[PDB]
Structure formats: C-alpha cells, structure tokens
Amino acid sequence: VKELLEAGVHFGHERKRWNPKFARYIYAERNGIHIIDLQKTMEELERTFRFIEDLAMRGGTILFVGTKKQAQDIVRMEAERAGMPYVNQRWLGGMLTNFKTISQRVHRLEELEALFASPEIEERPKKEQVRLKHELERLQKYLSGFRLLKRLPDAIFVVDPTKEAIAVREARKLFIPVIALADTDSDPDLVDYIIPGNDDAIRSIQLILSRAVDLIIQARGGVVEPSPSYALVQ
Amino acid sequence: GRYIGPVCRLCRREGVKLYLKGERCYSPKCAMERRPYPPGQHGQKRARRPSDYAVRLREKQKLRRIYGISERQFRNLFEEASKKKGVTGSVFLGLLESRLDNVVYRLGFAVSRRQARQLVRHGHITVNGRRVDLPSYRVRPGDEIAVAEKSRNLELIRQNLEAMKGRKVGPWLSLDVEGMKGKFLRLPDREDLALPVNEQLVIEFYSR
Amino acid sequence: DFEEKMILIRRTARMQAGGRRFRFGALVVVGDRQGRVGLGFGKAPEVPLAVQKAGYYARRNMVEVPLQNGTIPHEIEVEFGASKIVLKPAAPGTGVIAGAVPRAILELAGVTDILTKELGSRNPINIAYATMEALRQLRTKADVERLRKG
Amino acid sequence: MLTDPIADMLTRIRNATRVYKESTDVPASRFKEEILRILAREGFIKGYERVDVDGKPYLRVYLKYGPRRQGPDPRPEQVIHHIRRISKPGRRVYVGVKEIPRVRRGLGIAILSTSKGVLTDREARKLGVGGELICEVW
RNA sequence: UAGCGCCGGCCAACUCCGUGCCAGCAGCCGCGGUAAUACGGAGGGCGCGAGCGUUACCCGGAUUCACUGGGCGUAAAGGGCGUGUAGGCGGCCUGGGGCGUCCCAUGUGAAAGACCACGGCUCAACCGUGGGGGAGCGUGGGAUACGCUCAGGCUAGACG
RNA sequence: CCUGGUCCACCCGUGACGCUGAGGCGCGAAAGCGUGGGGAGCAAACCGGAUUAGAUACCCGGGUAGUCCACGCCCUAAACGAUGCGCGCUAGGUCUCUGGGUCUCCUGGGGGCCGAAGCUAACGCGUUAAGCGCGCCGCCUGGGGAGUACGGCCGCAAGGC
Lengths: 234, 208, 150, 138
Ligand SMILES: [Mg+2]
Ligand SMILES: [Mg+2]
Ligand SMILES: [Mg+2]
Ligand SMILES: [Mg+2]
Ligand SMILES: [Mg+2]
Ligand SMILES: [Mg+2]
Ligand SMILES: [Mg+2]
Ligand SMILES: [Mg+2]
Ligand SMILES: [Mg+2]
Ligand SMILES: [Mg+2]
Ligand SMILES: [Mg+2]
Ligand SMILES: [Mg+2]
Ligand SMILES: [Mg+2]
Ligand SMILES: [Mg+2]
Ligand SMILES: [Mg+2]
Ligand SMILES: [Mg+2]
Ligand SMILES: [Mg+2]
Ligand SMILES: [Mg+2]
Ligand SMILES: [Mg+2]
Ligand SMILES: [Mg+2]
Ligand SMILES: [Mg+2]
Ligand SMILES: [Mg+2]
Ligand SMILES: [Mg+2]
Ligand SMILES: [Mg+2]
Ligand SMILES: [Mg+2]
Ligand SMILES: [Mg+2]
Ligand SMILES: [Mg+2]
Ligand SMILES: [Mg+2]
Ligand SMILES: [Mg+2]
Ligand SMILES: [Mg+2]
Ligand SMILES: [Mg+2]
Ligand SMILES: [Mg+2]
Ligand SMILES: [Mg+2]
Ligand SMILES: [Mg+2]
Ligand SMILES: [Mg+2]
Ligand SMILES: [Mg+2]
Ligand SMILES: [Mg+2]
Ligand SMILES: [Mg+2]
Ligand SMILES: [Mg+2]
Ligand SMILES: [Mg+2]
Ligand SMILES: [Mg+2]
Ligand SMILES: [Mg+2]
Ligand SMILES: [Mg+2]
Ligand SMILES: [Mg+2]
Ligand SMILES: [Mg+2]
Ligand SMILES: [Mg+2]
Ligand SMILES: [Mg+2]
Ligand SMILES: [Mg+2]
Ligand SMILES: [Mg+2]
Ligand SMILES: [Mg+2]
Ligand SMILES: [Mg+2]
Ligand SMILES: [Mg+2]
Ligand SMILES: [Mg+2]
Ligand SMILES: [Mg+2]
Ligand SMILES: [Mg+2]
Ligand SMILES: [Mg+2]
Ligand SMILES: [Zn+2]
Known about the structure:
This is part of a larger assembly, with chains A, B, C and D. Chain B is an alpha+beta fold. Chain B has a 5-stranded antiparallel β-sheet. Chain B folds into 2 domains: 1-96 and 194-208, Ribosomal protein S4/S9, N-terminal domain (Ribosomal Protein S4 Delta 41, Chain A, domain 1, Orthogonal Bundle); 97-193, Roll (Structural Genomics Hypothetical 15.5 Kd Protein In mrcA-pckA Intergenic Region, Chain A). The longest helix of chain B has 16 residues, at 52-67. Chain B has helices at residues 10-13, 52-67, 71-83, 88-97, 100-106, 113-121, 149-152, 155-163, 199-205, and strands at residues 125-127, 130-131, 144-147, 173-176, 181-184. Chain C has 2 domains: 1-64, Double Stranded RNA Binding Domain; 65-139, Ribosomal Protein S5, domain 2. Chain C contains 4 helices and 10 strands; from the N terminus they run βββββαββββαβαα. In chain C, a hairpin with a 2-residue loop joins strand 7 and strand 8. Chain C is elongated, with a radius of gyration of 17 Å. Chain D has 2 domains: 3-80, Ribosomal Protein S8, Chain: A, domain 1 (2-Layer Sandwich), CATH 3.30.1370.30; 81-138, Dna Ligase, domain 1 (2-Layer Sandwich), CATH 3.30.1490.10. Chain D contains 3 helices and 7 strands, in the order H-H-E-E-E-E-E-E-H-E. In chain D, the strands form 2 sheets. In chain D, strands 3, 4, 5, 6 and 7 form a 5-stranded antiparallel β-sheet that branches. In chain D, strands 1-2 form a two-stranded antiparallel ribbon. In chain D, a hairpin with a 2-residue loop joins strand 1 and strand 2. The chains are: A alpha/beta, B alpha+beta, C alpha+beta, D alpha+beta. Chains in contact: A-D, B-C, C-D. The interface between C and D is medium-sized, with 12 and 12 residues. Bound molecules: magnesium ion (56 copies) and zinc ion. Residues 81-82, 84, 86, 88, 91 of chain B line the site of one magnesium ion (MG). Chain D binds 2 RNA strands through helix 1, helix 2, strand 4, strand 5 and strand 6.
C-alpha cells in the first residue's frame, strides 16, 4: 500500500482535447498529450484508498466496471481476486438502476446451470434443446461477474468514467459512491474518489487496480502476496 | 323567514346528525338513524367523487344549517369574524355561539334551537332583567340569560328546566335550575365546542 | 402515515393506422402533513394502474418542507417552464390561500397558513412541478447560518 | 466604458459563482470595495483583497460555496443564491428608513448607500437612516 | 304570506315522458337530424328567501399597457442602412457646495367617512363619544455614501 | 488615377474628449417614371404554333417597353441572421481568412461548425448568445374588416409614409 515513483506508467495521456475540469490534475503538455501531475495522483490515492479500506474492512460490496476492451481482463481478475463482482464485457442499462429486473437474468443463469447437469438435459428436439443452449452461453458472458451482486454495491470502481459513463450515472443517481481511475478526458466532478492517472495502458490500469485489491485484502486482514494478472500485462 | 320545513332531511343531505329537534333526534328515529342516505329519488345511488367546491359548500351548509341562521346573517357574522383579531375560524364559531337563541339552547331553557328561537321572539326570555326578543341578539360575557317570571309557570318551561336537573352544562356557561337563570361566562373556546364541522373549510368556501 | 391526493387525470391520445390509442396520465401528491411532500406523475393503459404508478413515483420524489408555526420560512417565486409560482409566508388563521394544485401539495406538506399566486402558464402539471421546486428551495435561518458561517 | 460599475461587479460575482470559480477580479473603486466589506462580513464571500492586474487596481473577490452534494449534479449550493442590482442609472431608487425593505423575512439583506455610509438593511434601520437602495442579496 | 333562479361542463343539484337539425336553448364551450341528465313538462334535487332573476355599467380575475409586474429568431413585435440634433445615460482619485437623497423638530393635513374602543335605541342597520394612523407641502436644524454641480488630478474608455 | 473603411505592432501623444440617438440630413436591390442616347442577347405586353374539356398558362417560334449609359426622380422588398447599437462578464474543440510573435505554438481581428454553464414552448441559441448584466432608440398588445377609408406630408405619375 504505497509507492510514489510509479511513473512506471500513468500520467501523460490522451491528446489535447481534454476536459478543462480535469485541468486541476494536470502538470503540463509535452509533445501533445497532457501529463497528469503525479504528486496529486498520490494525494488522491491516499484519500481514495482510505475510503476503500474503511468500506472494505466493513464487509462492503464493491462492483468493478471496466469494459474498455483495453483493460478488459485486468478487471475481472482483481475483481475475482476478491469477493467483489464485476462487469467485464458490456454494461447494460439498469444494472444498478433497473437492478431488481436485470437480476432476473442471474436468477435465470444459475437457473440453467441446473438443467445443464440433470436428467432433463436430453429433452425436446434440438428445437427447444438448442434455444436453451445459447440461452446460457451469453448470460455466462455478461453476468459472469454481475453474478455475485445480490444488492446494490456499496460503491463502484470504474476504470474510465467517460467510457463507462452510463454506469457512473447510475451510481450517482442511486447515491452509490463512485470510485474511478480517470484522466484528462473526463469530468472529475462526477468521481467521488478520483484516481487521476493513465486511464489506458494496461500497465497503469494494472498497477492501480491491482494495489486497490491489495489494500482491500490487507484491510480484510487475509493478507496475500502478488497478483496473477501481471501475465496478461503482456 | 328561517327555513321552516322538512328538517331531518337536511340531516340526511349533510349525512350527519344535526340536532334541529332536540328530543327524537336521540330516539331511534332521527332518520339519520336508519335511512342515512340523502333525500330525494336519488339518495341511494352510488355517490360521485365530490368537487373540492362541493365539499366546502356542503361543509358551510352543515355549520350554518345547525344554528338555523340565514345565509345573509351567517355571511355577515363570518365577515365580522374575519375583520376581527384572532384566528377567524375560532372567532366565527364563538360569535355564532353568542346568539341569544343559541345560548337559550345551551342553557336548556329549550329543547332545540328553533324552539329556543320562538321562546325569544315570544318574550319568554330575559337578559340582565329586561326582556329581549331578538334571536340574533349577541350575548356579552357576564350577562344573565333567564326566563321571565310571567313565563316560569308554563308547562314547556317546566318540562324543560326540569329535565335539566342534574344535567350538566357547557363550561363557558352556568345554570341555576331553580332560579331558571344562567350566565354566559366566557366566549366558548374552540376546544369547548365539539361541532361536526371542520371550519377551516368554511373559511375556504368564502375565500374563493 | 402518508396521505395521497390526486391532482388530476388526463386521457391523452396517440395515432395508428386504424385510429386513436389512449393512455392515462395521473398527477398524485403524497405527504405526512408533517413536513414531507412528494409529487408523482405516472401514466398507464388504464387509470388505476396509472394512479398507483403515480403514487409509487411520488414516494420516490420527497421534499423536506421546513414548516414554521404552520407557514414557510420566507417567500420564494419559482419558474418552471412557463409556469411561475409565488409562495408568500402568512400568519395563523390565514389558511392556505392557493389554487387547487399548489394547495393539495402545500396541505399534504404540513403547510397551514400561506399566501400563494399562480402566474404565467397555469398548466397544472408545470405549476405542480414549479411548486415542489419552490418548497425544495426554502431555506432556514439555521441553513443560511450554516452556509455563511465559514 | 462601464455603464453601471456596481452592476458590473454584482454581475461579475454572479457569473463567476455559477461556474464555481475560486476568485474573480473586478476593477477597483472605493464604493465597490465598501460593498465587498459587507459581502464579507455578512459572510457571502470568503473575503477579498486588492490586487494589481496588468498594472491596474482590481479587487480579488474570493467566493464561497456550500459542500459537494449527493446524487447527480454534486455541485455545491450557492452561498449567494441571489444578488440583484436595484437602483440603477436611469432609475435611481431611494427609501426612507420606514421604507427600507426586508429581504426574505430577514434571511437575506439589502445593501443601501446612506450619508452615514454603506449599510445593510439591519444597520441602516439601526442608525435610523435610509438612502439609495443599492442592491438585494440573499 | 312564499316565492324566484338553477340541476351537460365551468357550477351545488337527475330521472320519466314529449319532441325529432323541428320546436327550441345558449355566458363561453356547445345541445336538438327517434335512448337528449343541455329543448317543453313532470317527479325529484341544489341555491337563496320578501325576495329571486334579468339587462346595463364600474373594479376584479387580466403580470391581457406589466411602476409593483410583460415582451419582440420562427407566436403580434427591430426601424432597409448610416450620419447625426435635442434628450437620456456616464471610467478612477481628491476637495468645495449640499440641488436630488436621508434624518430630527415644528406648522399644515376642517367636519363627515374609513379603522379601534366604549356607549344610546330591547338587537342591528343608524347614531354618540373618545383614540390612532396619514402621503404631500411650508419652516428651522443636521448628514454627505450615492446622484448632481464646481475645482483639481489620473489613464484602464475614447481619440490621435 | 482619385477616395472610404479597417486590422496588427510600438507602446509614443491628448486626457473621459464617452454610449445611444425623437426629429433632421444622406444612402438605399428590382421594377417603375422624365429628357436624351443606346439596343448584341434576353424578354412583361403582344402576334402566332402546340397541349387541353377549355389553356386569356405551363412547351415552341417571334416580339415592344424594359434590361445598358447619362442626368433627374421614385424608396419599396422574404431591404433576412425574419435576431437594433455599445460595453463588461461567463468551459472548451475543430476548420478557415488576415496580422504580430521566441512559429510542431502563443497572441489579435474576421468567417463557420460542435459544444460547458446557462437560456428556450420547443426547434434551437451557446465568447459571432437567443447566456449573465447596465445604458439609449425602435417596435408588439387576439383574427377578419385593412395596410383599407379619411386627413396630412411627399411624388410628374405609379404610388410612398
Ligand atoms: Mg379574523
Ligand atoms: Mg385538453
Ligand atoms: Mg418565461
Ligand atoms: Mg391549481
Ligand atoms: Mg396566459
Ligand atoms: Mg423597484
Ligand atoms: Mg355538479
Ligand atoms: Mg342533450
Ligand atoms: Mg327522448
Ligand atoms: Mg343547462
Ligand atoms: Mg329539461
Ligand atoms: Mg331581510
Ligand atoms: Mg372586468
Ligand atoms: Mg391590471
Ligand atoms: Mg384586452
Ligand atoms: Mg415593467
Ligand atoms: Mg406577453
Ligand atoms: Mg409567418
Ligand atoms: Mg412575426
Ligand atoms: Mg436589421
Ligand atoms: Mg420588418
Ligand atoms: Mg449628445
Ligand atoms: Mg459618475
Ligand atoms: Mg463633497
Ligand atoms: Mg463632490
Ligand atoms: Mg439639500
Ligand atoms: Mg408632517
Ligand atoms: Mg378628517
Ligand atoms: Mg348597545
Ligand atoms: Mg367620530
Ligand atoms: Mg429644511
Ligand atoms: Mg460636508
Ligand atoms: Mg476631471
Ligand atoms: Mg504613452
Ligand atoms: Mg499628462
Ligand atoms: Mg450614432
Ligand atoms: Mg433605388
Ligand atoms: Mg432599374
Ligand atoms: Mg427610362
Ligand atoms: Mg429612351
Ligand atoms: Mg426570344
Ligand atoms: Mg401560347
Ligand atoms: Mg416565349
Ligand atoms: Mg436603434
Ligand atoms: Mg472557434
Ligand atoms: Mg506568423
Ligand atoms: Mg474567432
Ligand atoms: Mg480565429
Ligand atoms: Mg443544458
Ligand atoms: Mg432573458
Ligand atoms: Mg423536445
Ligand atoms: Mg451550438
Ligand atoms: Mg380588430
Ligand atoms: Mg375586434
Ligand atoms: Mg402598399
Ligand atoms: Mg401633392
Ligand atoms: Zn334529526
């Protein structure tokens, strides 16, 4: 739970076309591209992580959202590498806002996990036998991580608020605290706990998202060693 | 005149027991007592949701139809109440409760208000000694509402002031049954009255 | 607990090759006559379903009205679209002097003495919305105090 | 040339707060300074100081806002929800002490300029004077 | 002695019969072409009551001439454009005057009326007595922040 | 050749000399008018051919005024951004025309588009505001009757206000 010279990535990201609001977190522009002021990246981590542990060491359920195909794997892992649920593939309209409904999909997926392991598997011609084949398939692709949520998360850890804007917006609406790794092209004012830095570059998406789960574990006392996502970092 | 006519019918239209007959309105017959639906060929059909207007109109009627006052006098009193200091709704009720015919009712010298009224217009009542035959006469506090000796020996007065023996009376009043005289102690405080009327709605019928 | 009031219900029509296709709009007010009021506008194939939907929505939209001896802490004038609402504090005995829409709300809000005035578009829907915005904007000596303490 | 400098300042402040600026400059004048003195005391601004922009005397007006809010649109409530110029060149407005208005049942203020100086409606009423009703603020 | 208006919505009060885009109603929206809560009648109902309706007229609602309190891209509304007279409006600092403005005192502001209180006629209407407020203007004294005027200064407007 | 406006740099000179603007005066597309000139092409009117139920039109062949110049007059318009002028304040992105700079960009004036806050009935507007404000002018006040009647002023007239 530390490290300062993490310029190993982060900062300097997203061409000039920013969002003036994110100007407070910017150091300067060199050869195009705004370079995020790390001193502040730090400051925010300290505060954000605090919120994290506190709510982590209280049995808080956190939902990870990172659809950005870029860092679409470094998310589920650290997510799974904790109780925490996750939205890896694509975020659907109503995950949180229409939760009671979208939940019926999960209360249907586990509902098929059943049939696909009983004496009824061999029933109805491929007609109604194949309709229910694909049925699962997809669910298990979208609700793989949203599987865990059984009630609105106490928070949301978004990796790119701008991309994952619909999500943020639903947190907001439901007063669900919003934690998010964000940068130059985003509206900070919408992130409750900002992790200002490279929203792209799996390296940077890893360093942070990873350590976040570390402090989550350290907070849950169950102390653990390095993470298995450092592999996809290639 | 002041109405005159089918009265336990007003009771029905207002859907509540209005005591415009004293006795009988207690017996198993005030009609409100078994046959609560308004008068006329339609009273039993399902009622339609009343317009806010309808409510206040009915509400004002209920209250006025109680003291037997004419819309004219009723209106004037309310206007006087509005102009006066203090919470108008309150003041209004008190002012109505101050009519002599009414006091004569509260004191029991008479069964109903209508009866009471006639006892006033017929000179059977006295205020501080001199007789007063003005149903709308306003009683001040400390005044002695009474029966005139020349009337104390009337069968009606007897039955009436007799039935009043042991019977208690409004806290803003006082009654000496044998002396056939009572006193208007204080303007009845709103809480003292227990009329089946939400006067706030009346104030509203007159704001429109 | 919560008392519900139906501001209005309209029939609304739509067109299709064939004819018109109705829906029902319902504006419902909900409050505890003790400082809490909510507005709800729901529509559905049938009135009941609509109303119910409205009520359900009202409870979703609550306002904390700072009642004071039965009135409001001060005067606000709010403009919602073309409808403008004027709320003026009043003494006791006054009553709720307002049009049906603002009334229903003010009443279930716990407001008992207030001076009101509908200006601009008298459109019930936007007037009612104008109202909630007015109340929602009411502040208090303590509130101001909080804000200017710094 | 500014037409009504007080109105300018009133507006500069109004505008700057709608976008939640930290501070905001306004060309300096005793009179404007005097009003600021009140905005500050009444606690509508974190205060103000005199700066020298590009060689000329301005007045940094440090603005104040409430705290971040819940749900969507977390923008703070404004400390200065309202600030209107009243008397204006081409319709000057004066009042006697008896005519000094009461802004929002007291929850607000009215700044008038009197021969006893620039006062709030409270102060004016106290000193028992009246004057040119400058602006309204709440 | 009890009467008059109304009962489609606005707007409180509903059914039968007659009539059949007729006869008729009608404040606005509208109602009648064979099931009319809208026509005429009746039963019943609502409202008010020695009255109740109608017509006319004034203010209101009408922030619908908007001072309080409106507007003008497409709803009605920017002048075809410029130059410019009168007029309206006027950047920063200092000082004089004190016209506007503000303050105190005082005069004036008849009676009646209006408001409050008490009182006379059995009540009330009506009337009596007493009380309080009051803009405007005159006079005397005072204040000087803003507006104004005079004087000096400045350079951020303007012009060169 | 003669002449208007205007932008940038330097910061040099004056020292609030400013903004707006009833009336006034000037300018003001097309058509039209007067005198004279001009007249290739085009083309109201008109002369014909065709189409059609008819075709006082659309298509085709001709064709005068006019369209062109001068001088005088007329003064209208969807004379439009259907958006009066000036000033200050309120994210940015991108394209572009023109100037200065330490010129993979900064700064100024202009032309576009998208869009912060905000505005708006909505459509939309959004540092070229329809935003937030101050100053001054002009103008609206349901539709038809009617841009008519009358009167006045202007014009040769047509007509204009
Ligand atoms: Mg009263
Ligand atoms: Mg409709
Ligand atoms: Mg409006
Ligand atoms: Mg209403
Ligand atoms: Mg209107
Ligand atoms: Mg004013
Ligand atoms: Mg009715
Ligand atoms: Mg009918
Ligand atoms: Mg019939
Ligand atoms: Mg009728
Ligand atoms: Mg009939
Ligand atoms: Mg009479
Ligand atoms: Mg009228
Ligand atoms: Mg008016
Ligand atoms: Mg009119
Ligand atoms: Mg106005
Ligand atoms: Mg208007
Ligand atoms: Mg048009
Ligand atoms: Mg138009
Ligand atoms: Mg123009
Ligand atoms: Mg025009
Ligand atoms: Mg001038
Ligand atoms: Mg000046
Ligand atoms: Mg001086
Ligand atoms: Mg001076
Ligand atoms: Mg003076
Ligand atoms: Mg005087
Ligand atoms: Mg007098
Ligand atoms: Mg007396
Ligand atoms: Mg007198
Ligand atoms: Mg004097
Ligand atoms: Mg002096
Ligand atoms: Mg000078
Ligand atoms: Mg120089
Ligand atoms: Mg010099
Ligand atoms: Mg000019
Ligand atoms: Mg011309
Ligand atoms: Mg021409
Ligand atoms: Mg010619
Ligand atoms: Mg010629
Ligand atoms: Mg030809
Ligand atoms: Mg031909
Ligand atoms: Mg031809
Ligand atoms: Mg102009
Ligand atoms: Mg641009
Ligand atoms: Mg260059
Ligand atoms: Mg530009
Ligand atoms: Mg440019
Ligand atoms: Mg917006
Ligand atoms: Mg505006
Ligand atoms: Mg829309
Ligand atoms: Mg735009
Ligand atoms: Mg007309
Ligand atoms: Mg007309
Ligand atoms: Mg014409
Ligand atoms: Mg002539
Ligand atoms: Zn009875």
